[PDB]
């Protein structure tokens, strides 16, 4: 009992600029620091933007804020709390069957609003800031309009897709592959998080 450790905090580590017209990552903590902020909770960097890319011992994939959480997949984040300036903040939402959790979104970023145009061409963001084009094919899938073999999407649960007037349509979950290339998404939808909320 007396050495049974204890996990880490997820952190967050950089972010994917949306903010101008090129689209482009930004590290903002290696893996050294990341390692001790995961340990102790306590991440006193500035936090910027609607997507952060974040990890944890293990994993690195990708979060995002839609209307004052910052939301990510239940696969990379588990149960853990998040790094914040005060210490480790709990998941607010939690939901296993929908591969979903969120915290409170961090001071300083800024949330993207969820989509009621009710449109199919989407856009979905990388952990690379590639915006990749995805046409809407069910409630919750779309295919990818150039597939790619499955390593470009690898780390980029978390992140958005977003409808063409940058509404948040829904969060990345799930590659389809046959062998080895991604032909379509698997995404949780918006309507899906404004339930769980
Ligand atoms: C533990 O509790 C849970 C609860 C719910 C759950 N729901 C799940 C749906 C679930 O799927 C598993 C995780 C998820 C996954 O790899 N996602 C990310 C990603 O980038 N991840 S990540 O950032 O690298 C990482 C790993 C965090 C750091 C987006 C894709 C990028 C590339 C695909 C690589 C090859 C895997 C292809 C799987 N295709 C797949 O299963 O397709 C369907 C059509 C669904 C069969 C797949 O995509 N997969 C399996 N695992 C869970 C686990
Ligand atoms: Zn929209």
């Known amino acids: 009992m007396a050495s049974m450790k204890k996990k880490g905090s997820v952190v967050i580590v950089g972010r994917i600029n ?26 006193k960097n500035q936090v910027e933007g609607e997507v952060q890319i974040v990890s944890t011992a293990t994993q690195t994939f990708l979060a995002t804020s839609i209307n004052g959480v910052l939301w990510t ?3 990379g984040a588990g149960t853990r709390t998040i790094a914040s300036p005060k210490g480790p903040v709990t998941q607010m939402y939690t ?3 929908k591969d979903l959790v ?4 961090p001071q300083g970023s800024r949330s993207l609003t969820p989509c009621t145009c009710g449109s199919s061409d989407l856009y979905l963001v990388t952990r690379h800031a590639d915006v990749i084009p995805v046409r809407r094919r ?13 390593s470009y999407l690898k780390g980029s649960s978390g992140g958005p897709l977003l409808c063409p007037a940058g509404h948040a349509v829904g969060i990345f979950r799930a ?23």
């Open 18 to 43: 949306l903010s101008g017209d090129t689209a482009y990552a930004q590290q903002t903590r290696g893996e050294e620091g990341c390692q001790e902020t995961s340990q102790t909770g306590r991440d």
């Open 73 to 75: 997949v239940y696969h």
């Open 95 to 97: 939901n296993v069957d």
């Open 102 to 105: 969120g915290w409170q979104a």
């Open 138 to 150: 069910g409630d919750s899938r779309g295919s990818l309009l150039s597939p790619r073999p499955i």
């Open 175 to 197: 590659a389809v592959s046959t062998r080895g290339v991604a032909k379509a998404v698997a995404f949780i939808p918006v309507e899906s998080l404004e339930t769980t909320m």
